[PDB]
Amino acid sequence: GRSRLLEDFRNNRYPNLQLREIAGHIMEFSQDQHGSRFIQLKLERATPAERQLVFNEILQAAYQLMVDVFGNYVIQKFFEFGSLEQKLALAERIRGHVLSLALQMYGCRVIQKALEFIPSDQQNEMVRELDGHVLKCVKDQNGNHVVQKCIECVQPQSLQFIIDAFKGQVFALSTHPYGCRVIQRILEHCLPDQTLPILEELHQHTEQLVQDQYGNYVIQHVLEHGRPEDKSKIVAEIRGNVLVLSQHKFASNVVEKCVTHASRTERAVLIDEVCTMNDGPHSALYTMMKDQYANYVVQKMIDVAEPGQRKIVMHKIRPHIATLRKYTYGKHILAKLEK
């Protein structure tokens, strides 16, 4: 079982335990749920000499700590508060095992912390081991976190091989629960020459993406943070389909974001389209106000519709105000309307 020192520490025998006092017991403490937290907190404010004593004791088996549920935290604290020499030695211990660590539940967090704190040179040395394994890491439950961090932290020129690996795979990655997150990071951090081919593939498949459970969020991202040129292409895809996409579980989110982020003229064209559109025995507005998803698009269209059109819109809603109150969704509208 545990050493007596660790057992006593866990039983609160030592209210002032110090790092120097756990000499010889550091690997064990690092892999203990409470011993690890103790070391994590102490390293935050230990003197550099105190950090080195801890380090000298774990260096030889650092890799073992890297893949341990509690030991990985101690390794991370070194990248966070340690000396350049310690980070360098850890990077050297990581060399040749970046892929293995990136795919490991705890090791992936060590790689992420290292990327955030090591020099461009060692970042490049680490990211390059992923060459030929990009798509696998992007889709992996642990590996996607490493790829996302590379995108946020590494010089863009060193990320070119990752962009290259996405050629023709943007639709598949955007409809993946882990891959969609990597695509969003690319859009936020990469250079225009790198985001261009990605956006090109997103635009090509917008029709399918807006209806996908994960894909719609990538499109929403472009609507929320993208360039006007890109937002306009997406709006163009929604134009003429406001009625049908509004009633879609996922596409309705994109339609909503279009109303919110399209140009002045664009929002107009879209709102207009909903008033003059028909849906069988009634108007488009009619069907939408009471739909569980489409109702939000109607609400938001109000909050954004320029006074001129706002009148018209409602002028077409009142007549049905009776049947309106017959629904849970039409009440948010029932409210706003009353004014």
Side-chain angles (χ1 to χ4, degrees):
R2 297 181 285 259
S3 61
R4 162 71 181 269
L5 179 62
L6 176 60
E7 179 69 23
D8 282 344
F9 165 66
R10 284 165 62 105
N11 294 327
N12 301 116
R13 177 180 180 182
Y14 303 115
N16 291 102
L17 188 64
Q18 298 305 326
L19 288 174
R20 64 181 140 75
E21 292 163 357
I22 59 163
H25 302 71
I26 295 173
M27 284 293 295
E28 189 197 11
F29 266 66
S30 297
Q31 299 169 92
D32 179 81
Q33 169 172 40
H34 303 294
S36 175
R37 189 62 174 142
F38 169 78
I39 290 175
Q40 293 169 45
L41 293 172
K42 288 293 181 176
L43 287 174
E44 273 168 31
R45 45 205 54 179
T47 63
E50 301 175 326
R51 297 200 179 101
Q52 180 60 42
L53 298 179
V54 172
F55 194 81
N56 285 138
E57 197 170 319
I58 63 175
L59 180 62
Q60 296 172 47
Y63 193 92
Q64 175 183 164
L65 293 186
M66 280 174 204
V67 299
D68 184 75
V69 66
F70 293 120
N72 80 91
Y73 298 114
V74 172
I75 298 304
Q76 290 189 58
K77 286 291 162 179
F78 269 106
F79 281 117
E80 191 178 22
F81 300 91
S83 68
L84 174 35
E85 308 99 80
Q86 282 153 8
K87 294 181 192 175
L88 184 56
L90 288 173
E92 179 55 25
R93 300 262 55 65
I94 287 168
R95 199 166 61 68
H97 312 295
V98 172
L99 182 61
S100 188
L101 287 169
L103 295 175
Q104 213 278 330
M105 190 162 289
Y106 309 119
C108 69
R109 298 306 189 175
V110 167
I111 296 311
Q112 290 179 268
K113 264 291 191 287
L115 289 167
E116 168 167 359
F117 292 92
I118 65 186
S120 297
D121 245 17
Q122 277 67 217
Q123 283 182 325
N124 293 178
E125 266 186 39
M126 268 182 213
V127 305
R128 75 174 66 169
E129 282 179 38
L130 276 35
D131 182 25
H133 307 287
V134 179
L135 291 180
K136 182 179 171 60
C137 296
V138 167
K139 293 191 286 189
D140 186 78
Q141 71 174 307
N142 303 314
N144 78 83
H145 301 285
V146 170
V147 180
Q148 288 190 64
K149 194 62 69 178
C150 289
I151 292 152
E152 300 172 73
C153 304
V154 174
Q155 293 172 321
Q157 34 281 309
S158 311
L159 299 170
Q160 193 62 47
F161 81 96
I162 292 172
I163 297 304
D164 290 339
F166 288 0
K167 181 56 152 49
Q169 304 300 142
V170 175
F171 176 72
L173 297 174
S174 290
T175 56
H176 190 279
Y178 303 147
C180 61
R181 303 285 288 179
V182 179
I183 296 285
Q184 302 194 75
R185 301 293 84 72
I186 295 292
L187 298 176
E188 297 160 351
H189 300 272
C190 294
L191 302 162
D193 42 293
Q194 293 174 328
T195 59
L196 177 65
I198 304 295
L199 283 161
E200 181 186 301
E201 284 184 41
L202 288 176
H203 287 309
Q204 292 160 27
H205 300 268
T206 291
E207 196 184 328
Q208 300 154 292
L209 291 166
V210 301
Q211 287 185 51
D212 185 82
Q213 65 192 317
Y214 303 121
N216 83 89
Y217 288 106
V218 175
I219 302 299
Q220 291 190 59
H221 189 284
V222 181
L223 283 170
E224 306 184 69
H225 315 300
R227 282 186 148 295
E229 314 83 67
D230 298 302
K231 300 195 291 182
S232 290
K233 294 185 178 178
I234 293 162
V235 173
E237 289 273 3
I238 271 55
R239 184 175 176 188
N241 300 298
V242 186
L243 180 67
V244 51
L245 295 181
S246 281
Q247 305 170 59
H248 191 278
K249 187 180 185 170
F250 305 117
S252 58
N253 300 323
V254 174
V255 180
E256 204 258 2
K257 291 299 194 303
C258 277
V259 185
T260 314
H261 302 276
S263 74
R264 194 76 153 177
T265 51
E266 288 174 349
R267 303 200 294 275
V269 164
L270 287 177
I271 296 169
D272 182 48
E273 163 185 342
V274 174
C275 293
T276 63
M277 184 66 205
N278 69 309
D279 183 41
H282 315 71
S283 61
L285 258 163
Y286 176 76
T287 300
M288 294 166 68
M289 59 174 98
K290 64 179 177 178
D291 178 69
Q292 61 165 154
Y293 300 114
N295 80 76
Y296 292 80
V297 178
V298 183
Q299 187 191 309
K300 179 65 64 175
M301 239 171 310
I302 296 295
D303 313 298
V304 312
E306 295 181 58
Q309 288 192 319
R310 187 177 297 192
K311 181 178 179 61
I312 304 181
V313 179
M314 316 193 90
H315 252 187
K316 290 197 176 186
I317 309 175
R318 178 200 314 166
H320 323 295
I321 184 60
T323 306
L324 179 167
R325 199 189 72 178
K326 299 171 63 291
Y327 302 111
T328 304
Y329 318 124
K331 291 178 183 173
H332 283 290
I333 308 176
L334 178 67
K336 185 73 60 57
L337 179 60
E338 298 159 312
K339 268 190 58 179

